[PDB]
């Protein structure tokens, strides 16, 4: 029953990495941006890493 609680952390980790993606995408327009695209690149590969972490954990509920 606590495996349902973990993706509530994993999906909320996804929302707090795509709102931060919207932070950098809002301030790539004003500019440092080459030093600032270094942060969205680690953000978006982690957002792909977090989205992969949900779809193998939301599919892991059906296996039980």
């Amino acid at each position: 029953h606590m495996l349902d609680r973990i993706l509530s952390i994993r999906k909320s980790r996804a929302n707090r990495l795509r709102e931060s993606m919207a932070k950098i995408n809002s301030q790539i327009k004003e500019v440092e941006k080459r030093s600032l695209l270094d942060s969205q690149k680690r953000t978006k590969e982690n957002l792909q890493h977090v989205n992969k972490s949900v779809e193998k954990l939301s599919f892991a509920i059906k296996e039980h």
Partner: protein, 412 residues
């Protein structure tokens, strides 16, 4: 004629020699009604519904007839009727109702109930373009609470292509019936018949209201019109029939429901199909809960009807009105109702919606770009016009040919 012997709480006994079954009686001091459900040698069991605590030993009964009837006639267009078959209002004198029908009739001969081929124009672009009704199809809308069942239901009432509408609100409270029959205008109520009963009424009347509305619609069918019956909340009919069956004394078999509920749903809502003279298109509603996903009434209604609409809560949480989940919902008589080019267009739009759900969960995963799947890209670029085709405001009523024209637009 006969006197009460005992009161067993919810069921009474009375000595009446050679009393028949199905009859209904007046308690002679008051004006109260009660039917017969079981016959012994001289001492018949007898089910009351209104009031029990005003009863003696030796209180008299009064005969009316063999089977309970209702007064049906062509003056019912625009009347709030009790579920037992009486006009509720007192501001008008009850008009000329000449005919005399019973509540228990039978469906027609199955070799006369023939195949349905014509479409039932509905106004909603989602139920009529992608899914399609037919004149004689019994739709069942499976909704929750707070998804927009009543707004869609008034959209059905207003923009339908029917001649006489017959509503039936079985278990309600007065704010909801006032909110719902205040929601549809006088041009709707000039053809509409209202069989309204509320949750404060006893269980026998909330059970007989479905029979009453079906009998009114059978009468307006037998003159040869396209009647549109709308039983609201067959769940609450089922709760009323559960209470009547358990008060009669009957072992529950599935989910706390007696066998009488499961055997009385088909002989209720098998009457509302095509006929050799006119036809009745019925549309029932089931309130599905998150507490019981099993819900035996929902499964049996899905097993009796033909074509269900599912209103999901996710499509209400994102603003997608009407909240019809296409692909989770379907109609059975569509492949012999619409043309072939519309049947190959509507399948491709549903396949585009399902493909878009898959491709959004594969595009946020990091493993999609444009070019390596042709079926994906066309769904990607047709997302917003498919969403402009499905979504429809309350006061935007479309015609059938405009729906098919916009559908042929939105597929290619």
């Amino acid at each position: 004629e006969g006197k009460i012997i005992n009161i067993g709480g919810t069921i009474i006994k009375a000595r009446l020699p050679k009393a028949r079954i199905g009859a209904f009686y007046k308690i002679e001091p008051s004006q109260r009604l009660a039917e017969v459900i079981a016959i012994d040698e001289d001492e018949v069991f007898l089910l009351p519904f209104e009031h029990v605590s005003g009863m003696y030993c030796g209180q008299w009964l009064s005969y009316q007839g063999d089977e309970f009837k209702i007064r049906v006639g062509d003056a019912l267009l625009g009347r709030l009727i009790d579920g037992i078959g009486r006009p509720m209002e007192s501001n008008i004198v009850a008009p000329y109702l000449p005919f005399e029908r019973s509540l228990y009739a039978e469906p027609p001969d199955p070799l006369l109930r023939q195949v349905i081929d014509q479409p039932f124009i509905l106004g909603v672009r989602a139920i009529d373009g992608l899914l399609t009704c037919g004149i004689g199809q019994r739709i069942g809308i499976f909704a929750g609470s707070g998804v927009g069942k009543s707004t869609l239901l008034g959209m059905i009432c207003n923009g339908a292509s029917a001649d006489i509408i017959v509503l039936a609100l079985i278990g309600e409270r007065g704010r909801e019936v006032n909110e719902f029959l205040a929601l549809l205008p006088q041009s709707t109520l000039s053809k509409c018949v209202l069989v309204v009963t509320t949750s404060d009424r006893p269980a026998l009347e909330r059970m007989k209201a479905a029979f009453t509305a079906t009998t009114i619609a059978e009468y307006f069918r037998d003159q040869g019109k396209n009647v549109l019956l709308m039983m609201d909340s067959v769940t609450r009919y089922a709760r009323a029939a559960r209470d009547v069956g358990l008060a009669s004394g009957e072992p529950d078999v599935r989910g706390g429901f007696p066998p009488s509920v499961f055997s009385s749903l088909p002989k209720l809502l098998e009457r509302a199909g095509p006929a050799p003279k006119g036809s009745i298109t019925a549309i029932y509603t089931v309130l599905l809960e998150s507490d019981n996903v099993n819900d035996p009434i929902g499964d049996e209604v899905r097993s009796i009807l033909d074509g269900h609409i599912v209103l999901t809560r996710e499509l209400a949480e994102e603003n997608h009105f009407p909240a019809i989940d296409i692909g989770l919902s379907a109609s059975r008589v569509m492949h012999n109702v619409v043309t072939s080019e519309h049947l190959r267009a509507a399948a491709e739009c549903k396949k585009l919606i399902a493909t878009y759900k898959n491709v959004e969960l594969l595009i946020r995963i990091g493993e999609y770009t444009m070019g390596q799947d042709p079926e994906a890209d066309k769904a990607i670029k047709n997302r917003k016009l498919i969403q402009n085709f499905i979504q429809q405001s309350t006061k935007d009523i479309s015609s059938y040919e405009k729906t098919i024209e916009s559908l042929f637009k939105v597929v290619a």
